[PDB]
Amino acid sequence: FTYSGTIPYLDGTFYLSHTFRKVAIQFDSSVTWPGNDRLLTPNEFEIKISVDGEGYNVAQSNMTKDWFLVQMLANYNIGYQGYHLPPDYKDRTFSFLHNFIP
Amino acid sequence: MTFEMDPINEPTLLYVLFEVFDVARVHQPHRGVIEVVYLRTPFSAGNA
Amino acid sequence: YYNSGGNLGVLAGQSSQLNAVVDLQDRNTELSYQMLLANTTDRSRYFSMWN
Amino acid sequence: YYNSGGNLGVLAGQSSQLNAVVDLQDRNTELSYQMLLANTTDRSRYFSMWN
Amino acid sequence: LSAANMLYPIPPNATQLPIPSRNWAAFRGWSLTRLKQRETPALGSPFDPY
Amino acid sequence: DPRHALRDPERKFLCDRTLWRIPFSSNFMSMGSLTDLGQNLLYANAAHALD
Amino acid sequence: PTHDVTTERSQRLQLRFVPVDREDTQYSYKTRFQLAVGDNRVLDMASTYFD
Amino acid sequence: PTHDVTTERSQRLQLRFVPVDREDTQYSYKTRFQLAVGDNRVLDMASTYFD
Numbered sequence: 089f090t091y092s093g094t095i096p097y098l099d100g101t102f103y104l105s106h107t108f109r110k111v112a113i114q115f116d117s118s119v120t121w122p123g124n125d126r127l128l129t130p131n132e133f134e135i136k137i138s139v140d141g142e143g144y145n146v147a148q149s150n151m152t153k154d155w156f157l158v159q160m161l162a163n164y165n166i167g168y169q170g171y172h173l174p175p176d177y178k179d180r181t182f183s184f185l186h187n188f189i190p
Numbered sequence: 191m192t193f194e195m196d197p198i199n200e201p202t203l204l205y206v207l208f209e210v211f212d213v214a215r216v217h218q219p220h221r222g223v224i225e226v227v228y229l230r231t232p233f234s235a236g237n238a
Numbered sequence: 239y240y241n242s243g244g245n246l247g248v249l250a251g252q253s254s255q256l257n258a259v260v261d262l263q264d265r266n267t268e269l270s271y272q273m274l275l276a277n278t279t280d281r282s283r284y285f286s287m288w289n
Numbered sequence: 290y291y292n293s294g295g296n297l298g299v300l301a302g303q304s305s306q307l308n309a310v311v312d313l314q315d316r317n318t319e320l321s322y323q324m325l326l327a328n329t330t331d332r333s334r335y336f337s338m339w340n
Numbered sequence: 341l342s343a344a345n346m347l348y349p350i351p352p353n354a355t356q357l358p359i360p361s362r363n364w365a366a367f368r369g370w371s372l373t374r375l376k377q378r379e380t381p382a383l384g385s386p387f388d389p390y
Numbered sequence: 391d392p393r394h395a396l397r398d399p400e401r402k403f404l405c406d407r408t409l410w411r412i413p414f415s416s417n418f419m420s421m422g423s424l425t426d427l428g429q430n431l432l433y434a435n436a437a438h439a440l441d
Numbered sequence: 442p443t444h445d446v447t448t449e450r451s452q453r454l455q456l457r458f459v460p461v462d463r464e465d466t467q468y469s470y471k472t473r474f475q476l477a478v479g480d481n482r483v484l485d486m487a488s489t490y491f492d
Numbered sequence: 493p494t495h496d497v498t499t500e501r502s503q504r505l506q507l508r509f510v511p512v513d514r515e516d517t518q519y520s521y522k523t524r525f526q527l528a529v530g531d532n533r534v535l536d537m538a539s540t541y542f543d
Contacts, residue, residue, distance in 0.1 A: 101407055102407055103406040105408060105410055106404050114441050115235070115236060115440060115441075116235070116439050117439060118234050118264070119235020120236045125260070125453055126454050128455065131244070131263050133412065139387055139389060141386055142517050149403045150403065158411075159411065162412070162419075163411065168488060169485045181407055184408055187404075189403060192356065193358075193359070195350070195357065197353045197354065198353070200377070202350040203347050203374070203375045204372065205345070205372060206347075206348070206370070207341075207371035209370065210343055210344060212265065212343075221253075222251035223254045224251050225256070226258040230262075231365055232363040233344040235262075237441065238440040241383060242386065244386045248524070254480070255477070256452075266341060266345045303437045415447075416446070416447035421446070426446065459514065459515040475512075
């Protein structure tokens with residue numbers, strides 16, 4: 089261990105969440121989750137797309153619409169009834185929107 | 191499973207085919223109403 | 239498009255609204271169709287219509 | 290590892306998921322085993338298998 | 341066809357190739373071959389840039 | 391400016407000191423510490439494998 | 442809650458609609474969509490927008 | 493047979509449907525049709541195709 093800078097694993101100073109493309113979850117190596125054709129891309133969670141194609145990107149960034157929605161719901165339960173800046177008390181240094189910068 | 195094959199100077203893939211039963215019933219109760227029920231066993235919905 | 243949840247085809251009754259087409263990128267329709275023809279007909283002749 | 294909640298061994302049915310091995314750092318399996326052998330057999334002979 | 345399609349990468353010059361998976365029921369049988377990565381388009385996505 | 395040469399757009403984003411979330415709920419919303427799915431028989435009854 | 446909240450059957454979370462007709466005028470652009478709300482569903486306009 | 497086979501009233505043999513909506517994406521093309529099966533009729537998908 090030849091390092092003395094901040095340890096994201098402890099202090100929680102993460103900064104590499106923008107390096108993910110997609111995530112695929114499956115149970116019993118067959119049943120994909122959540123499945124049921126919930127997302128625009130029911131076979132996985134595309135965090136970001138390189139080639140627009142259809143333009144599943146929002147917030148004028150490279151983040152898919154599906155991912156943005158998920159994050160909003162899991163943090164402020166906002167998404168099923170319009171997208172709006174959640175109340176301040178819910179926007180802490182460890183929140184999503186608070187750190188999201190397109 | 192362990193597959194031993196001849197070496198090739200390029201990236202390849204091992205295409206496997208777990209033969210199963212991919213069947214689906216189509217039920218039409220009323221006018222303009224299609225209810226289907228799929229069922230692929232084994233491997234219902236991936237493996238985990 | 240086949241076996242692609244990204245562009246899954248739709249076929250449901252307007253009243254039902256419940257899509258009857260449930261595809262999985264685990265299945266392979268394309269190849270399936272091929273083999274099917276080679277079992278019901280002579281896959282040596284040609285038929286422009288279906289190319 | 291024995292009598293260590295930090296590395297307690299597991300042995301439960303996949304369906305049950307409820308571990309059947311409940312150990313306590315208060316018990317002493319090691320010593321217990323020793324004495325057990327000295328009561329059922331002649332603890333003077335040797336047996337490579339179990340060292 | 342009635343079969344689940346699986347694809348496992350085979351590094352160049354590789355000889356051995358293990359594959360772990362488990363079935364809770366009983367199927368019909370196995371069927372397999374070998375394909376070249378370059379000749380196999382990555383499906384699932386509405387577009388393959390590579 | 392009129393001296394401008396043909397370019398090309400490029401998008402991206404940053405999200406530090408944060409953790410990607412994927413709640414195990416049927417609607418992804420938080421309706422309680424013990425989610426609904428986390429209380430569904432399909433999981434409490436039999437064991438599964440994740441990948 | 443574990444009932445009377447979320448549906449068990451397949452169903453998209455956010456649908457996408459394409460213009461059934463669009464007129465590009467010299468200084469205006471008009472498009473008409475056929476917003477269809479499937480049965481047993483409820484749409485909250487606030488969650489709709491034009492991409 | 494001279495009854496209970498073919499109908500006497502007018503009726504097309506093969507209908508033609510036009511896209512009620514079509515989206516030309518940079519790398520994909522999507523179109524939706526309102527396949528309507530008139531009453532007292534039966535359509536065998538196998539006889540359908542995209543021109």
